[PDB]
Design a protein around this ligand. Structure first.
Ligand SMILES: COc1c(C)c(C)c2onc(C)c2c1C/C=C(\C)CCC(=O)O
Length: 133
């Protein structure tokens, strides 16, 4: 029952500073433009210890399945090959991606009826807000 409040189907309703975050990460111009247009749905489900987060958009689909605390391979929407570890910290899903000696952290939390996602690369943060679909 860990992540019960995250489970469901969510749609993107606001984004702030995602272009600057993508620049910080190293995403190129064309990908930033097309990815920044997308309005993904995110589908979160849990089966035993396995959490699955799917992102469906016009830009890309993606899907990750993982066990908390257990590192996995992830190919990101922008085609980085990263090593990811996702934990729960005080009710927040904390997702660290490591690649090429770099690191970024993505935090997902429930706030009121929203799922709020904060992406941080060095000093740059982006906030993306999702509502139930
Ligand atoms: C941040 O990693 C990226 C990137 C870099 C780019 C270009 C992207 O383009 N499309 C997606 C989807 C996407 C993502 C995943 C987003 C997140 C893991 C959280 C924000 C959200 O779920 O909205």
């Amino acid at each position: 029952h860990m992540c019960d409040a995250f489970v469901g189907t969510w749609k993107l309703v606001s984004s702030e500073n995602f272009d600057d975050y993508m620049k910080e990460v190293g995403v190129g111009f064309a990908t930033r433009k097309v990815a920044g247009m997308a309005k993904p749905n995110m589908i979160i489900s849990v089966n035993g210890d396995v959490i699955t987060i799917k992102s469906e958009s016009t830009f890309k689909n993606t899907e990750i399945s993982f066990i908390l605390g257990q590192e996995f391979d992830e190919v990101t929407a922008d085609d980085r090959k990263v090593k990811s570890t996702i934990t729960l910290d005080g009710g927040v899903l904390v997702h660290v991606q490591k690649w090429d000696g770099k690191s970024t952290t993505i935090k997902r939390k429930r706030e009121d009826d929203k799922l709020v996602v904060e992406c941080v690369m060095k000093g740059v943060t982006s906030t993306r807000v999702y509502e139930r679909a």
